[PDB]
Amino acid sequence: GMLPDDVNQADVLADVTAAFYRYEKALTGNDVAVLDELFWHDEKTVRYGAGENLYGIEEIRAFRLARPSAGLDRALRNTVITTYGHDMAVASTEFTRTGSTKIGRQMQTWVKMPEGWRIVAAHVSLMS
Amino acid sequence: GMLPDDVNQADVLADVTAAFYRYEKALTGNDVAVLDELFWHDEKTVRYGAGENLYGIEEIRAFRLARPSAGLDRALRNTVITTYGHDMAVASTEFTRTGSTKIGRQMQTWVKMPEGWRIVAAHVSLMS
């Protein structure tokens, strides 16, 4: 049960936030090692990206290596990080790019595993 | 703390799965009252839809009433529902519609509140 006071406990929110910005940096720099580190290592993990639907860490890894590295840098905007209790978080952000005209959105659900905070599901898309 | 045994406990998953399909019913039948009941009533709630970025339950409610009621029906595909401990879940699915050629994706993060299972963040989009 999630009680109202259990939302956004300062310390939980600091850990998750650092983790989020660390993922942000790995993503824009194409640090595939870390991008793999931060994702949950399981067959149930899901990543819906702009042009692909990926199920399991195996497919997400294939994706990562097959992905073009040019124009990965992006500016975030309207970022909302909300924690629930001591081991669950939702990071939501919009983003834009120097090249594009469309607006990007990214939603990620983080869970604290024994190995650390891990993204168990992510959806990334361009707004119509 | 989330150990491997805390993933997909039978009872928790049975509940969240039923809540997920209740929402599916409300969405396709445009049961705005239920659609609202099932979303978390808070300013922090976030819904990224195909063509809009909604922040807070008030913005989400406006959207429900402004939305066209025609063609809301859909077919689900590749649905994955994973629960974490006894009070968080992530439901992800693809979907298609009779008319369209594009593939839809929905991802929802559910938290069990005292009033019940509630979607705290949702992202819907068409694969580009």
Ligand SMILES: [Cl-]
């Ligand atoms: Cl896998």
Ligand SMILES: [Cl-]
């Ligand atoms: Cl609000």
